[PDB]
CSV table of N, CA and C in Angstrom, one decimal:
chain,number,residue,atom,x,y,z
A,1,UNK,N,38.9,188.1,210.1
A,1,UNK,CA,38.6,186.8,209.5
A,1,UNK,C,38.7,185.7,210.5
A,2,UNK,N,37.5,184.8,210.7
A,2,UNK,CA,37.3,184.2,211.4
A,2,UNK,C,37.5,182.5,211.2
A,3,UNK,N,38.7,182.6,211.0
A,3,UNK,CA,39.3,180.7,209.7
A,3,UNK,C,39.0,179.9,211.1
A,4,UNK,N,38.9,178.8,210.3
A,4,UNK,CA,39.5,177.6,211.3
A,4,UNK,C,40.6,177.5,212.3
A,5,UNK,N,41.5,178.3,211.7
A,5,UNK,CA,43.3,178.1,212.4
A,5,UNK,C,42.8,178.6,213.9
A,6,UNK,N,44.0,178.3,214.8
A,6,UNK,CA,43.1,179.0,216.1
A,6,UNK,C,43.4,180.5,216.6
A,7,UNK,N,42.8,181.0,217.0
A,7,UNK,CA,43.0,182.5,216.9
A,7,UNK,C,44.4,183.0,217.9
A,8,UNK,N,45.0,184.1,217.2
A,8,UNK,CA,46.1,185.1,217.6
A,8,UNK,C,46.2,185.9,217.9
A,9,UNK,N,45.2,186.9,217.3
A,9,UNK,CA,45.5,188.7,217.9
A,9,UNK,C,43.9,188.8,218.1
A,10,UNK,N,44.5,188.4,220.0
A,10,UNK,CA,43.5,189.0,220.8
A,10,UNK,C,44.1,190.0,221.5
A,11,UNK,N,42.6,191.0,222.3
A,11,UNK,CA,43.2,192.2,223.1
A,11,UNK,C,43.8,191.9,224.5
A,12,UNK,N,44.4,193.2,225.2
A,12,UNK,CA,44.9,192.7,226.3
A,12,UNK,C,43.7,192.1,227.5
A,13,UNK,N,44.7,191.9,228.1
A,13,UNK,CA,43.7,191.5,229.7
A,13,UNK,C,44.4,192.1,231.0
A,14,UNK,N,43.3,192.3,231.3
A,14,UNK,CA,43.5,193.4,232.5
A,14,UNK,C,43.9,192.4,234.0
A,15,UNK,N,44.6,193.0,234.7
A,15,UNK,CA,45.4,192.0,236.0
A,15,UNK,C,45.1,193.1,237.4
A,16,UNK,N,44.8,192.5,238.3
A,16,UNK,CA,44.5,193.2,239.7
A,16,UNK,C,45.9,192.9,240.4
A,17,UNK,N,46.1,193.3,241.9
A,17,UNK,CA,46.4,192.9,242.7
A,17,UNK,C,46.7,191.6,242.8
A,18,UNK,N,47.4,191.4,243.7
A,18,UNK,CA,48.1,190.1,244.5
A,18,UNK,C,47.4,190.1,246.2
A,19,UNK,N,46.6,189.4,246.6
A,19,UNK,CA,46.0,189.9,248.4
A,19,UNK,C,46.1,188.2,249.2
A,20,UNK,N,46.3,187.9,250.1
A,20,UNK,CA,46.8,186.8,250.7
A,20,UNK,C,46.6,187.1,251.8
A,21,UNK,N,45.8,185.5,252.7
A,21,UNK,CA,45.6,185.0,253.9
A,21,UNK,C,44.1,185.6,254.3
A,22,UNK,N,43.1,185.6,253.0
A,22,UNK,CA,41.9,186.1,253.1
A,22,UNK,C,41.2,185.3,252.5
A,23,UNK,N,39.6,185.5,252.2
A,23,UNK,CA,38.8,184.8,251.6
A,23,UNK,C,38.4,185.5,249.9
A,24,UNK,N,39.1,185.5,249.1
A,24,UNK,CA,38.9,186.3,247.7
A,24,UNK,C,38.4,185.2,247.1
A,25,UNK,N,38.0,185.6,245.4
A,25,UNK,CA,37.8,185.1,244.6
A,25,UNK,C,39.2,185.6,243.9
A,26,UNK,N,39.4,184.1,243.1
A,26,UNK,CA,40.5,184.0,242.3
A,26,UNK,C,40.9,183.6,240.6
A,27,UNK,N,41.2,184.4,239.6
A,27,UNK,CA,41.5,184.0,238.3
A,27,UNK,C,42.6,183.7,237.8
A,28,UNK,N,43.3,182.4,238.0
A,28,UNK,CA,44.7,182.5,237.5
A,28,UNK,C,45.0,181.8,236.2
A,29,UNK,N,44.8,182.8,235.2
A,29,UNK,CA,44.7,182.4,233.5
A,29,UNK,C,44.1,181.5,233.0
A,30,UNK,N,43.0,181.5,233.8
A,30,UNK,CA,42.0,180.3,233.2
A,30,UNK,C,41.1,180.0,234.3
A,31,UNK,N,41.9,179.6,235.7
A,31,UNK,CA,41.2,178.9,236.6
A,31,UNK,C,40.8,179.5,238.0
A,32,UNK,N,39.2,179.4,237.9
A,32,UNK,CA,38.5,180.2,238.6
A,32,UNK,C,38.3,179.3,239.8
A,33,UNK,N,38.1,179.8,241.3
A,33,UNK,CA,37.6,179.3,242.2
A,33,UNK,C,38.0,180.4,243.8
A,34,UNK,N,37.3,179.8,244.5
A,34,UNK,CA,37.4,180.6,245.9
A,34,UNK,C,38.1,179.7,247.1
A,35,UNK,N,39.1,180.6,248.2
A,35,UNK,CA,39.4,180.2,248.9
A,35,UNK,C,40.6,181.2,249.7
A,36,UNK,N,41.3,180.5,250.3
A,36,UNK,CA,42.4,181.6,250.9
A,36,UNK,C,44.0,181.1,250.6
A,37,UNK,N,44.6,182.0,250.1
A,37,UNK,CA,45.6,182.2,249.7
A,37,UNK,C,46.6,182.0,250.2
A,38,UNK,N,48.0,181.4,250.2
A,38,UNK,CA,49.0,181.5,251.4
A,38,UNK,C,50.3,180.9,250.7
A,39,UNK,N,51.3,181.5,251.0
A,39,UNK,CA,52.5,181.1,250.6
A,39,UNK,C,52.9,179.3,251.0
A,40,UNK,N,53.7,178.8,250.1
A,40,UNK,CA,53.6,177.5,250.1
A,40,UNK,C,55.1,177.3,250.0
A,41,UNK,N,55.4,175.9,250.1
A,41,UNK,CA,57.0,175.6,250.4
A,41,UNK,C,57.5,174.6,248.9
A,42,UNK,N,56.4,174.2,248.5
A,42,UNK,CA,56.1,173.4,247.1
A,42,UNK,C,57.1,173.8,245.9
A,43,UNK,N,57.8,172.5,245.1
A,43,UNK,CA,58.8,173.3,244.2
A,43,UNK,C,58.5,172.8,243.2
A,44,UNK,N,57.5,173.7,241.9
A,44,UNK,CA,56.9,173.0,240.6
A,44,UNK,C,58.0,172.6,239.9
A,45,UNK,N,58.5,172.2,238.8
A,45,UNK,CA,58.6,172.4,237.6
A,45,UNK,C,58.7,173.3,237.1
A,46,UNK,N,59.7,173.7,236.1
A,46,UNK,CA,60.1,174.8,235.5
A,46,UNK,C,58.4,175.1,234.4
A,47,UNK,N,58.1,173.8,233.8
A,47,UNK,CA,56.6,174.2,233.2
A,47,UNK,C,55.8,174.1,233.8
A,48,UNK,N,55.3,173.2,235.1
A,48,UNK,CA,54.1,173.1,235.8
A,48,UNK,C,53.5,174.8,236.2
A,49,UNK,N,52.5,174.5,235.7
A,49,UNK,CA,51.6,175.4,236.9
A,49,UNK,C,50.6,175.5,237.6
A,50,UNK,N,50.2,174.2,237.7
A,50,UNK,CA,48.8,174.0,238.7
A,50,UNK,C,49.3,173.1,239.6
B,1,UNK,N,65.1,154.5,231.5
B,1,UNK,CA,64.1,155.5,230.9
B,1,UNK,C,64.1,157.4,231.8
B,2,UNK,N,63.5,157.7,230.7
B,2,UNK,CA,63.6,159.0,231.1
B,2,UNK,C,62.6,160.2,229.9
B,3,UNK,N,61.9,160.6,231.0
B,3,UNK,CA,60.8,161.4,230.3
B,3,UNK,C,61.2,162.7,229.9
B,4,UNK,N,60.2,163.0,229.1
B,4,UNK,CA,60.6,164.6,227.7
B,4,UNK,C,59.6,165.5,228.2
B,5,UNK,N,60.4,166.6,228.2
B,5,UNK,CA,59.6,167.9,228.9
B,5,UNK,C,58.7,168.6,227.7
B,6,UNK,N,57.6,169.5,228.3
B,6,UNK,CA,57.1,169.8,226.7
B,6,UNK,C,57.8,170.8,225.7
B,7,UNK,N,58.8,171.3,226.2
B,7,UNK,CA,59.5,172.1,225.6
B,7,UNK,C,58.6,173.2,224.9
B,8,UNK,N,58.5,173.5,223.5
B,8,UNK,CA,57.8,174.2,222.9
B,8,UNK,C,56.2,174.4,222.4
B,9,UNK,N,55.9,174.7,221.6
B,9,UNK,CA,54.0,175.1,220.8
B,9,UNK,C,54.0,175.6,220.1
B,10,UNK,N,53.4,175.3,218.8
B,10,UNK,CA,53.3,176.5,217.7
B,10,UNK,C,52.0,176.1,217.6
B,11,UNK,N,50.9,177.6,217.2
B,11,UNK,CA,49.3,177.5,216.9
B,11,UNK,C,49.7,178.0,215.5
B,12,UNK,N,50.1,176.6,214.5
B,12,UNK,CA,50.7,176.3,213.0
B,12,UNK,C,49.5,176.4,212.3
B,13,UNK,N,48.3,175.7,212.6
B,13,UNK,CA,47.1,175.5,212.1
B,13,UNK,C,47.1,174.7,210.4
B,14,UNK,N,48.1,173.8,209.9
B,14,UNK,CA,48.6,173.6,208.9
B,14,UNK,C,48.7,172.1,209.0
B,15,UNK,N,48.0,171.4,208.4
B,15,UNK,CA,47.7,169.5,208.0
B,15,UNK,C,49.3,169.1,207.6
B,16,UNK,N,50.0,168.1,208.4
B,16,UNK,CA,51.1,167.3,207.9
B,16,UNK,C,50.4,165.8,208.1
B,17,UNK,N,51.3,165.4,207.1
B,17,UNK,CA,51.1,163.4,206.8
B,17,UNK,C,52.1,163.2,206.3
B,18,UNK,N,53.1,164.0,205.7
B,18,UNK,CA,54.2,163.6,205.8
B,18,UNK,C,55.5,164.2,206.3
B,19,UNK,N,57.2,163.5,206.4
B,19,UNK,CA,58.4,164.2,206.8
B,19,UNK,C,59.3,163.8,206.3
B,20,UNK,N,60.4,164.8,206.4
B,20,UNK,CA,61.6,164.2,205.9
B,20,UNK,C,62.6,165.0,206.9
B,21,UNK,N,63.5,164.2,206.5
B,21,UNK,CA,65.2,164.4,207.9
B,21,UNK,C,66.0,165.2,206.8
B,22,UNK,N,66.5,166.4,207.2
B,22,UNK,CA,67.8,166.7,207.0
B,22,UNK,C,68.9,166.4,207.5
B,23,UNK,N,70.4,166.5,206.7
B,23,UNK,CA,71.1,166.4,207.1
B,23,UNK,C,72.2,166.9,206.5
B,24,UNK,N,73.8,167.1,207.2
B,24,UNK,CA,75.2,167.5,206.5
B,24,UNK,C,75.6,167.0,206.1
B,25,UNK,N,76.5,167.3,204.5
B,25,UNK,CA,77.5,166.7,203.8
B,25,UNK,C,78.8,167.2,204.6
B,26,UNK,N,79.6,166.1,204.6
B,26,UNK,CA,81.2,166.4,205.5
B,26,UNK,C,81.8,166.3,204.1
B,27,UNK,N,81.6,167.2,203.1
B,27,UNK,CA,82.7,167.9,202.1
B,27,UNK,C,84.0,168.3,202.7
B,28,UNK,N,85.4,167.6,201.7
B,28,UNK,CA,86.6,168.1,202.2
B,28,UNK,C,87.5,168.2,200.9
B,29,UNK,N,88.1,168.0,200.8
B,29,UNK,CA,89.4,168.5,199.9
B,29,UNK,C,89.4,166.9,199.1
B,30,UNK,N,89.7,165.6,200.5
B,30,UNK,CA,89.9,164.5,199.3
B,30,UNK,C,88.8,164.0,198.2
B,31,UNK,N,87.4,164.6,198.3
B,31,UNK,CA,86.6,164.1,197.7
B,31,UNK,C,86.9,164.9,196.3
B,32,UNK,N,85.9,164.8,195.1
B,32,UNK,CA,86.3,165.1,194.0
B,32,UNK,C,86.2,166.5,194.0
B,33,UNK,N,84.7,167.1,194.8
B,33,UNK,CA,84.3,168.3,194.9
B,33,UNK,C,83.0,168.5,194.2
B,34,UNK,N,82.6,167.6,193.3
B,34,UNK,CA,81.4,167.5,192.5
B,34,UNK,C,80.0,167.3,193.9
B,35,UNK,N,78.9,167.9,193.5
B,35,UNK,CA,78.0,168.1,194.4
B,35,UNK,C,77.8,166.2,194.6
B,36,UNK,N,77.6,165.7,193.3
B,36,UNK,CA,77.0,163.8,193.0
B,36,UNK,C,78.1,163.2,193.1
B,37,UNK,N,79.6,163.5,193.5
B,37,UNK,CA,80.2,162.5,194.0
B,37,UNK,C,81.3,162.9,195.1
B,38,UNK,N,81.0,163.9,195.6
B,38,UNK,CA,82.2,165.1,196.1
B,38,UNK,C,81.4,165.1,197.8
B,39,UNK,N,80.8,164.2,198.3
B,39,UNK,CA,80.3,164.1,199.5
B,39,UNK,C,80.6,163.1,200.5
B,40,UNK,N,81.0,163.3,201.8
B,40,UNK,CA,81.1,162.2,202.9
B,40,UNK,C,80.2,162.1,204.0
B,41,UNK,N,80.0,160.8,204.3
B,41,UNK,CA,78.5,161.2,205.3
B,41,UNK,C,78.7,161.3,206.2
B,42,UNK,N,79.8,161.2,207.1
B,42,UNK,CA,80.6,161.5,208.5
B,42,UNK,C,79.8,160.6,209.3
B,43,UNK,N,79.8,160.3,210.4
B,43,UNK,CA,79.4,159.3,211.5
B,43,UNK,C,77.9,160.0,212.4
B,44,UNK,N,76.7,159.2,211.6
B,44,UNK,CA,75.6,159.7,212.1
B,44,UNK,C,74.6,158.5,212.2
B,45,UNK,N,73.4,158.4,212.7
B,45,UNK,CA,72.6,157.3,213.1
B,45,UNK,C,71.2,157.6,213.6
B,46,UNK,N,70.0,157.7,213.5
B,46,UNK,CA,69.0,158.1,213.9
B,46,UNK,C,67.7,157.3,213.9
B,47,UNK,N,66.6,156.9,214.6
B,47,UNK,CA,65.7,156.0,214.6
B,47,UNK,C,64.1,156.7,214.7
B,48,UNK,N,63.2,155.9,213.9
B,48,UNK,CA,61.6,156.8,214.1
B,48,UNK,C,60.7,155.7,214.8
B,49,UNK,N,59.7,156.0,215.4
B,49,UNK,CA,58.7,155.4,215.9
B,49,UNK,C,57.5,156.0,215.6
Protein backbone atom coordinates (compact mmCIF):
# COMPACT_ATOMS: atom_id res chain seq x y z
CA UNK A 1 0.00 0.00 0.00
CA UNK A 2 1.24 3.09 -1.27
CA UNK A 3 -0.48 5.94 1.55
CA UNK A 4 0.66 9.25 1.86
CA UNK A 5 2.56 8.51 5.27
CA UNK A 6 6.24 8.25 4.34
CA UNK A 7 7.51 4.94 3.48
CA UNK A 8 9.15 2.21 6.08
CA UNK A 9 9.85 -1.18 4.87
CA UNK A 10 12.33 -0.82 2.30
CA UNK A 11 14.93 -3.49 1.12
CA UNK A 12 18.45 -3.65 2.15
CA UNK A 13 21.27 -1.74 0.58
CA UNK A 14 24.24 -3.16 -0.43
CA UNK A 15 27.87 -1.38 0.98
CA UNK A 16 31.38 -1.81 -0.67
CA UNK A 17 34.63 -1.25 0.61
CA UNK A 18 36.34 1.62 2.36
CA UNK A 19 39.61 2.68 -0.39
CA UNK A 20 41.63 6.04 0.45
CA UNK A 21 44.20 8.50 -1.02
CA UNK A 22 42.82 7.73 -4.58
CA UNK A 23 40.60 9.12 -7.14
CA UNK A 24 37.04 6.98 -6.59
CA UNK A 25 33.61 7.75 -6.88
CA UNK A 26 31.83 8.06 -3.70
CA UNK A 27 28.11 7.31 -2.06
CA UNK A 28 27.76 8.28 1.48
CA UNK A 29 23.90 7.64 2.18
CA UNK A 30 22.76 9.98 -0.05
CA UNK A 31 25.68 12.07 -1.20
CA UNK A 32 27.27 11.39 -4.42
CA UNK A 33 30.41 13.02 -5.77
CA UNK A 34 34.18 12.38 -6.90
CA UNK A 35 37.46 13.10 -5.43
CA UNK A 36 40.16 11.66 -3.03
CA UNK A 37 39.77 10.46 0.21
CA UNK A 38 42.00 11.05 3.28
CA UNK A 39 41.86 10.95 6.86
CA UNK A 40 41.02 14.24 8.56
CA UNK A 41 41.74 15.72 12.09
CA UNK A 42 38.11 17.47 12.15
CA UNK A 43 35.84 16.73 15.29
CA UNK A 44 31.95 16.66 14.21
CA UNK A 45 29.21 16.51 16.47
CA UNK A 46 27.82 13.64 17.94
CA UNK A 47 24.86 14.26 15.08
CA UNK A 48 26.65 16.07 12.36
CA UNK A 49 27.58 14.31 9.30
CA UNK A 50 28.51 16.29 6.46
CA UNK B 1 21.45 31.21 25.58
CA UNK B 2 22.01 27.94 24.53
CA UNK B 3 21.01 25.72 21.58
CA UNK B 4 18.97 22.26 21.34
CA UNK B 5 20.38 19.30 19.73
CA UNK B 6 17.98 17.40 17.38
CA UNK B 7 17.78 14.65 19.60
CA UNK B 8 15.12 12.31 18.03
CA UNK B 9 12.39 11.55 14.66
CA UNK B 10 9.52 9.73 14.26
CA UNK B 11 8.09 9.12 10.44
CA UNK B 12 4.35 9.46 12.70
CA UNK B 13 2.70 10.49 9.38
CA UNK B 14 -0.40 11.66 11.75
CA UNK B 15 -2.03 15.59 11.60
CA UNK B 16 -1.78 17.35 15.31
CA UNK B 17 -3.38 20.99 16.04
CA UNK B 18 -3.73 20.29 19.29
CA UNK B 19 -1.79 19.29 23.07
CA UNK B 20 -2.05 18.84 26.39
CA UNK B 21 0.67 18.51 29.42
CA UNK B 22 0.63 15.80 31.81
CA UNK B 23 1.34 15.74 35.03
CA UNK B 24 1.79 14.11 38.97
CA UNK B 25 -0.44 14.12 41.82
CA UNK B 26 1.89 14.26 45.16
CA UNK B 27 -0.92 12.03 47.03
CA UNK B 28 -0.01 11.37 50.76
CA UNK B 29 -1.58 10.30 53.77
CA UNK B 30 -2.66 14.02 55.04
CA UNK B 31 -4.92 14.60 52.15
CA UNK B 32 -8.39 13.03 52.39
CA UNK B 33 -7.54 10.25 49.79
CA UNK B 34 -10.53 10.99 47.51
CA UNK B 35 -9.34 11.13 43.77
CA UNK B 36 -11.46 15.15 43.71
CA UNK B 37 -10.01 16.23 46.84
CA UNK B 38 -7.18 13.88 48.03
CA UNK B 39 -4.50 15.62 45.73
CA UNK B 40 -1.29 17.96 46.18
CA UNK B 41 0.34 19.63 43.31
CA UNK B 42 3.96 19.62 44.76
CA UNK B 43 6.35 22.45 43.37
CA UNK B 44 6.13 22.61 39.49
CA UNK B 45 6.18 25.52 36.74
CA UNK B 46 6.33 25.26 32.98
CA UNK B 47 6.07 27.78 29.95
CA UNK B 48 4.88 27.41 25.99
CA UNK B 49 5.79 29.43 23.06
Amino acid sequence: ELLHAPATVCGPKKSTNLVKNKCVNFNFNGLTGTGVLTESNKKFLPFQQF
Amino acid sequence: FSALEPLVDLPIGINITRFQTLLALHRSYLTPGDSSSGWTAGAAAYYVG
